[PDB]
């Protein structure tokens, strides 16, 4: 789901700040992957860019130390993205978005992702 | 001094197209040599012989295997397992392509497949696909000759190219038993082999294959070292 903080209300994008672009393979341009692509463990569903404070103050001396000596940029977005567990991967079969219709003027937008798996028996099933 | 080695077939059904039966016979043989060439033949005809068979199906216009097309009664993974009992021939080491391309309101069965100069299908019924409304169905095709079952990745997307884990079985069964002569003094013994193929060989070829890929297997030890 998608959530209106104070900053904005979590858009959702197809292109994520400095996150590998192999990760973002099956990411269609609207920002949620279309059906028939055969998701791994660790690759990202949805990916919404929800809004990060521009706290370089709180930034860990780490993360300044690495984002200045390799000139990795400074960005006010979150990692936020339905990223696979392990295991779970599979094809998707269906796709689901929909938002909010109510009192409030903002709509959350919540996203259904369908993973099948042609599940074989294997050592240790009962 | 008393008899010689024989051997002969003595029953050949052909119970359908795509289902074979063969029954032989040994003839004198002395104690301890029916048990090998039982226990040997079987194994090699269960796990030697190669066959070829379709291994990944390409279509047009489809999402994923669990998808359902305008026109066809059949779903795509239905599909696949259908394609997959088709039996084909071949001799030659090496992956080929084939392709399938068949208009409406017809019902395609194997004899719709189109192949390359070398390979050919034994039956010319088994159903494959049915359709109902008048719409284009194009399908490509992967063969592969391999031995023993064999499982592939999915890999190779394009915009669909699903691989069917085709076993490669043209055996389908295999029995042996091994009787008493009565020679007196001496203890002989009749072998009777049973060969049951799917038609991609017959008996007195897989035995043949089979005896051949044993006697490969067993040479190494006669070269020295």
Same mark, same amino acid.
């Given at each position: 789901?998608?959530?209106?903080?104070?900053?904005?209300?979590?858009?959702?994008?197809?292109?994520?700040?400095?996150?590998?672009?192999?990760?973002?393979?099956?990411? %269609?341009?609207?920002?949620?992957?279309? &059906? $028939?692509?055969? @998701?791994? #463990?660790?690759?990202?569903?949805?990916? +919404? !860019?929800?809004?990060?404070?521009?706290?370089?103050?709180?930034?860990?001396?780490? %993360?300044?130390?690495?984002?200045?000596? &390799? $000139?990795?940029? @400074?960005? #006010?977005?979150?990692?936020?993205?339905? +990223? !696979?567990?392990?295991?779970?991967?599979?094809?998707?079969?269906?796709?689901?978005?929909?938002?909010?219709?109510?009192?409030?003027?903002?709509?959350?937008?919540?996203?259904?992702?369908?993973?099948?798996? +042609?599940?074989?028996?294997?050592?240790?099933?009962? | 001094?008393?008899?010689?080695?024989?051997?002969?077939?003595?029953?050949?059904?052909?119970?359908?197209?795509?289902?074979?039966?063969?029954?032989?016979?040994?003839?004198?043989?002395?104690?301890?040599?029916?048990?090998?060439?039982?226990?040997?033949?079987?194994?090699?005809?269960?796990?030697?012989?190669?066959?070829?068979?379709?291994?990944?199906?390409?279509?047009?216009?489809?999402?994923?295997?669990?998808?359902?097309?305008?026109?066809?009664?059949?779903?795509?993974?239905?599909?696949?397992?259908?394609?997959?009992?088709?039996?084909?021939?071949?001799?030659?080491?090496?992956?080929?392509?084939?392709?399938?391309?068949?208009?409406?309101?017809?019902?395609?069965?194997?004899?719709?497949?189109?192949?390359?100069?070398?390979?050919?299908?034994?039956?010319?019924?088994?159903?494959?696909?049915?359709?109902?409304?008048?719409?284009?169905?194009?399908?490509?095709?992967?063969?592969?000759?391999?031995?023993?079952?064999?499982?592939?990745?999915?890999?190779?997307?394009?915009?669909?190219?699903?691989?069917?884990?085709?076993?490669?079985?043209?055996?389908?069964?295999?029995?042996?038993?091994?009787?008493?002569?009565?020679?007196?003094?001496?203890?002989?013994?009749?072998?009777?082999?049973?060969?049951?193929?799917?038609?991609?060989?017959?008996?007195?070829?897989?035995?043949?294959?089979?005896?051949?890929?044993?006697?490969?297997?067993?040479?190494?030890?006669?070269?020295?070292?």
């Amino acid at each position: 789901q998608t959530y209106v903080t104070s900053q904005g209300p979590e858009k959702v994008t197809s292109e994520i700040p400095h996150l590998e672009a192999h990760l973002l393979r099956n990411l %269609d341009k609207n920002g949620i992957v279309r &059906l $028939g692509s055969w @998701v791994e #463990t660790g690759d990202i569903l949805v990916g +919404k !860019l929800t809004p990060q404070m521009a706290k370089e103050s709180s930034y860990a001396p780490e %993360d300044r130390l690495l984002r200045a000596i &390799l $000139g990795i940029q @400074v960005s #006010t977005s979150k990692e936020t993205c339905l +990223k !696979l567990p392990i295991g779970g991967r599979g094809r998707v079969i269906d796709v689901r978005w929909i938002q909010k219709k109510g009192g409030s003027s903002y709509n959350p937008e919540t996203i259904h992702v369908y993973i099948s798996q +042609k599940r074989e028996i294997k050592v240790g099933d009962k | 001094s008393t008899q010689t080695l024989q051997w002969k077939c003595v029953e050949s059904r052909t119970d359908s197209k795509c289902l074979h039966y063969g029954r032989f016979i040994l003839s004198p043989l002395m104690k301890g040599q029916a048990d090998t060439i039982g226990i040997a033949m079987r194994r090699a005809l269960l796990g030697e012989i190669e066959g070829t068979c379709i291994t990944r199906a390409k279509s047009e216009k489809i999402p994923h295997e669990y998808s359902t097309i305008l026109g066809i009664q059949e779903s795509v993974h239905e599909i696949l397992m259908n394609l997959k009992e088709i039996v084909l021939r071949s001799n030659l080491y090496g992956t080929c392509e084939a392709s399938i391309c068949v208009r409406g309101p017809r019902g395609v069965t194997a004899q719709d497949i189109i192949l390359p100069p070398y390979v050919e299908i034994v039956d010319n019924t088994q159903h494959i696909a049915s359709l109902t409304e008048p719409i284009d169905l194009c399908i490509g095709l992967q063969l592969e000759r391999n031995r023993g079952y064999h499982i592939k990745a999915p890999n190779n997307f394009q915009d669909g190219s699903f691989p069917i884990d085709a076993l490669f079985m043209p055996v389908r069964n295999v029995n042996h038993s091994i009787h008493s002569y009565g020679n007196g003094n001496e203890k002989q013994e009749i072998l009777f082999l049973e060969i049951w193929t799917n038609g991609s060989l017959t008996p007195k070829e897989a035995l043949y294959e089979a005896s051949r890929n044993l006697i490969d297997l067993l040479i190494p030890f006669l070269h020295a070292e």
